Curated annotation (Swiss-Prot), chain A:
One of its GO terms (molecular function) is structural constituent of ribosome. One of its GO terms (cellular component) is cytosol. The lineage of its organism: Bacteria, Pseudomonadati, Pseudomonadota, Gammaproteobacteria, Enterobacterales. This is Large ribosomal subunit protein bL32. Residues 1-37 are annotated as: Disordered. InterPro entries: Ribosomal_bL32, Ribosomal_bL32_bact, Ribosomal_zn-bd. Belongs to the bacterial ribosomal protein bL32 family. Keywords: Ribonucleoprotein, Ribosomal protein. It comes from the Bacteria. Part of the 50S ribosomal subunit. Contacts L17. GO terms for biological process: cytoplasmic translation; response to radiation; response to reactive oxygen species; ribosomal large subunit assembly. It comes from Escherichia coli (strain K12).
UniProtKB/Swiss-Prot annotation, chain B:
GO terms for cellular component: cytoplasm; cytosol; cytosolic large ribosomal subunit; large ribosomal subunit. Belongs to the universal ribosomal protein uL22 family. The lineage of its organism: Bacteria, Pseudomonadati, Pseudomonadota, Gammaproteobacteria, Enterobacterales. HAMAP family: Ribosomal_uL22_B (MF_01331_B). L-tryptophan binds at K90. It comes from the Bacteria. The gene is rplV. Part of the 50S ribosomal subunit. In TnaC-stalled ribosomes forms part of the binding pocket for L-Trp with the leader peptide and uL4. This protein binds specifically to 23S rRNA; its binding is stimulated by other ribosomal proteins, e.g. uL4, bL17, and bL20. It is important during the early stages of 50S assembly. It makes multiple contacts with different domains of the 23S rRNA in the assembled 50S subunit and ribosome. The globular domain of the protein is one of the proteins that surrounds the polypeptide exit tunnel on the outside of the subunit, while an extended beta-hairpin is found that penetrates into the center of the 70S ribosome where it lines the wall of the exit tunnel. Removal of most of this hairpin (residues 85-95) does not prevent its incorporation into 70S ribosomes. Two of the hairpin residues (Gly-91 and Ala-93) seem to be involved in translation elongation arrest of the SecM protein, as their replacement by larger amino acids alleviates the arrest.
Curated annotation (Swiss-Prot), chain C:
InterPro entries: Ribosomal_bL34, Ribosomal_bL34_CS. This is Large ribosomal subunit protein bL34. The gene is rpmH. Part of the 50S ribosomal subunit. Disulfide bonds: none annotated. PROSITE patterns: RIBOSOMAL_L34. It comes from the Bacteria. Belongs to the bacterial ribosomal protein bL34 family. One of its GO terms (biological process) is cytoplasmic translation. It comes from Escherichia coli (strain K12). The keyword Ribonucleoprotein applies.
Swiss-Prot record, chain D:
This is Large ribosomal subunit protein bL17. Belongs to the bacterial ribosomal protein bL17 family. It comes from Escherichia coli (strain K12). Keywords: Ribonucleoprotein, Ribosomal protein. The keyword Transport does not apply. Requires L15 for assembly into the 50S subunit. GO terms for cellular component: cytoplasm; cytosol; cytosolic large ribosomal subunit.
RNA sequence: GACGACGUUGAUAGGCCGGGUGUGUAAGCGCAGCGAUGCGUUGAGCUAACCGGUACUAAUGAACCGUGAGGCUUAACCU
RNA sequence: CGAAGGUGUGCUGUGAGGCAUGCUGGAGGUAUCAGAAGUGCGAAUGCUGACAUAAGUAACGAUAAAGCGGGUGAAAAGCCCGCUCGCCGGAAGACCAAGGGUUCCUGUCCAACGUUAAUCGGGGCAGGGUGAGUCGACCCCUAAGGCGAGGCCGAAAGGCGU
RNA sequence: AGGACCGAACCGACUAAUGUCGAAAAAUUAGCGGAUGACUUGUGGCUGGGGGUGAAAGGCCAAUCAAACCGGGAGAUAGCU
RNA sequence: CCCGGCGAGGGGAGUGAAAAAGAACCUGAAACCGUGUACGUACAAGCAGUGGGAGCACGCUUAGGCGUGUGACUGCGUACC
RNA sequence: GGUUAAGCGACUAAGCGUACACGGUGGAUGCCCUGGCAGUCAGAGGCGAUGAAGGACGUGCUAAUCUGCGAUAAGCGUCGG
């Protein structure tokens, strides 16, 4: 539970070698509305494969 | 022509804003707005509210061009601390320091 | 737990009050040192 | 170790779990759409689809059966009285799940459950 | 986190019909009893994950990283 | 037309150091030779201020319990309403004394405080509210008990007491 | 009638757990001992550091007690780090 | 004036000698923390330096080679009080 | 020129190291004074029942606190400058 001899800022870096946020670059474009949602999701205006699905 | 926008004293820590403002290093703006609109975090609330304020400083003060407009440098740097006192058990306290951070967004056409 | 300061103003007044501490000569020196050490609140007042 | 089990626990005791899925399924058919998280959306489906299954072949006894499982006759009033000819032909599924997005409250995978036949 | 099965050239999941299984004679009517209840309907009814099928809904066109015949020298075979 | 200080740089002395100079800096510095000391820091589990580490780990404070729709709003699991669900019921209900002293309420705001967000708050800004011949004290009467006119007693204070 | 029995309140702390950088500088859940007495609680006083008080443990005297705490002797002294 | 939540914060403009003097305000070192460029680095172990040293990258002189950066690999080497 | 084999063989860098340029936090250094210590020199060497030292609560155009003052309350009269 304790540290006896403080690790350098070197090894503090290499522990942070894998924290990097996964990119969500894979956007989609609508079939018959042309707008952009996230893939397998709905827009801000209720479109999903060219349908007013939620009408909100 | 070059322009810079800064949010000073953003109420978080440096590694919390370093992680999403690592992806938008060396990007164009419209792919950066689209990688920050759908990153599910709090720093993506922070700097995406400021990264759009940087392109405002282009279209208004510097180069109105936004289509082919790059982001050159972005580096979140530390700020002050709100050193409150946290109570730990058995009578002893604990000097908490609520962290605070500064972010620059630098926008130009290299 | 039953912590030590279970307070009052009736215990407080007749012990550490003005006329209590400015009764005897050994009390009076405290009122004549809190003066000279320049304290605002002399002993207890509301 | 879960190997070939089913019915996710959703981090509540069984008594709490069953009583929520009542008052979501009561809430589901009254407003016809709900926003929930992804698993509750994914597992309100496995609970509600019995109801409109056991309400096409209308009987006297199945009224209490959708009252022993519901204890809400106003929801039972919408069943058997509109839902009958609404679902004669759908041999099977009645829910088109929609993946909406992300809860700005606490980063949940939000979603949308509906009955299929929608015109309002 | 990996490995595996599928993504409308679809049985990968949920539902659904049936079977299988488990519990036992559902409810509601009629009869016999002043009554509790017993009989008939009725080995009915209800049935988690089980097994066999059915695309009913959910598993989209893309977008994406990955390229554009693969260095130097010698020997052995192509001419 | 640039003092000290800071920050690099080329030179210089056996070392402690020195001298010239680029940038930053914006009003003071001090030769040569001598005089006096709060005169040279790595340690003393030294003191004080600040910043690392463990670590983005642990934990979020009772295992009464949620779920949905609507609205306000820039953004809502937490705020306001409605609809059910669940918990307390010689209490986790409602009044009072103690003790706290605006903590109650409307408008308004979210930097900070609330172990999170927050339009909400016992938080900040502003204004408002506490109305008694009978309720409690103050007031008339004593207990335990404290002072204590004369006095007794004691280096002095002061102790006991009618 | 009972320093009588059983058992809540009230009280006390026996056993185990948990906790022991605690939710807490002595607690929480499961039990346990008593419960009209030599009991329990509230409020207001009296006693005092070589002195109080004690069904006596050197226990208690504001989380500290084989002599409390503050200031003053006093920058005690230290053949010792 | 633009962007933002008629927030915070910030970029221009204007004052001013200067806003890398802006109310956390003269000067602004070090620890600690990042940005960029250059070099080394994923078969090598060990007080992390020193002696040697290839290549690469640069300021240059003067084109003969020094200066600075890094430093593969190698010889020794077990911190201070 | 092509073909099989054999030997040898960089650029890759998730991060990390070092140097420079860049700020980021930080508030040390130099400089500054209506702050304070030690004294030289005269003077005083007291205030107090024609109510003190030290305080409470009020007073203005006012919300607050400091200074002054006291139902005559940041002030009245009076003789002067």
């Amino acid at each position: 539970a304790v540290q006896q001899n403080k690790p350098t800022r070197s090894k503090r870096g290499m522990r942070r070698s894998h924290d990097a946020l996964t990119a969500v670059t894979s956007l989609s474009v609508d079939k018959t509305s042309g707008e952009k949602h996230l893939r397998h999701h709905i827009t801000a205006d209720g479109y999903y494969r060219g349908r007013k699905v939620i009408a909100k | 022509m070059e322009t810079i926008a800064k949010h000073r004293h953003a109420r978080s820590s440096a590694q919390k804003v370093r992680l999403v403002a690592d992806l938008i290093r060396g990007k164009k703006v419209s792919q950066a707005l689209d990688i920050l609109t759908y990153t599910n975090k709090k720093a993506a609330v922070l700097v995406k509210k400021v990264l759009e304020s940087a392109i405002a400083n282009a279209e208004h003060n510097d180069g109105a061009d936004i289509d082919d407009l790059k982001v050159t440098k972005i580096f979140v740097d530390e700020g002050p601390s709100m050193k409150r006192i946290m109570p730990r058990a058995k009578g002893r306290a604990d000097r908490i320091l609520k962290r605070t951070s500064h972010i620059t967004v630098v926008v130009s056409d290299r | 737990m039953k912590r030590t300061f279970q307070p009052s103003v009736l215990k407080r007044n007749r012990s550490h009050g003005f006329r209590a501490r400015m009764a005897t000569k050994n009390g009076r020196q405290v009122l004549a040192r809190r003066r000279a050490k320049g304290r605002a609140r002399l002993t207890v007042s509301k | 170790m879960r190997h070939r089990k089913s019915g996710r626990q959703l981090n509540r005791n069984s008594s709490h779990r069953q009583a929520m899925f009542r008052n979501m399924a009561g809430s589901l058919v009254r407003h016809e759409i709900i926003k929930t998280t992804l698993p509750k959306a994914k597992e309100l489906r496995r609970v509600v689809e019995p109801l409109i299954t056991l309400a096409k072949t209308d009987s006297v006894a199945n009224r209490r059966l959708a009252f022993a499982r519901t204890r809400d006759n106003e929801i039972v009033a919408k069943l058997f009285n509109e839902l009958g000819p609404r679902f004669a032909s759908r041999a099977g599924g009645y829910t088109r799940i929609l993946k909406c997005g992300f809860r700005a409250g606490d980063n949940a995978p939000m979603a949308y459950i509906e009955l299929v036949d929608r015109s309002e």
